[PDB]
């Protein structure tokens, strides 16, 4: 087992840190995070300014869902429903 | 898998238990420091015949 360990370690680090595919995956996930953040920024920018009432309600709908109390209530309801369906 | 993942967690735990004991190098190099500290203590012998 120790010999197989050494054989695997001889390649898990060498020739792997060179191309840095782990760094590539980290860059991909960082890019996804930055994209979602900037898209949220753009949505905020377009929302900050028939249709006027709809735009006004858009701000309140976007703000309400982000509240932690709403998230706690939703997760509690989901857990209760899952227990109910698992009450069998 | 998941117990193995728990074992993998244990792996990380072992990586925390023993793999984090690398501390700070505090020398000139990383491998050449080992070479220097290894080749400076070496002493000649005689091998009488």
């Amino acid at each position: 087992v120790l010999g197989v360990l050494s054989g695997e370690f001889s390649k898990e680090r060498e020739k792997a840190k060179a191309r840095g595919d782990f760094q590539k995956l980290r860059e991909k996930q960082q890019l996804e995070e930055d994209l979602k953040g900037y898209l949220d920024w753009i949505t905020q920018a377009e929302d900050i300014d028939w249709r006027r009432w709809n735009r006004f309600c858009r701000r309140k709908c976007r703000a309400a869902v982000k509240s932690n109390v709403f998230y706690w209530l939703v997760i509690f309801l989901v857990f209760l429903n899952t227990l109910t369906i698992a009450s069998e | 898998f998941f117990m193995m993942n728990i074992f993998v967690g244990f792996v990380i735990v072992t990586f925390q238990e023993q793999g984090e004991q690398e501390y700070k190098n505090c020398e000139l190099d990383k491998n050449q420091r080992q070479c220097v500290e290894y080749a400076l203590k070496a002493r000649p012998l005689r091998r009488y015949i």
Binding site: V4, E12 | M4, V11
Partner: peptide, 22 residues
């Protein structure tokens, strides 16, 4: 030659563990 491969599969699991260590 079977069991070693399974152990190599376990090594692959170790590689999976490597995939779980990366």
């Amino acid at each position: 030659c079977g069991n070693y491969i399974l152990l190599n599969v376990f090594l692959a699991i170790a590689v999976d563990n490597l995939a779980d260590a990366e």
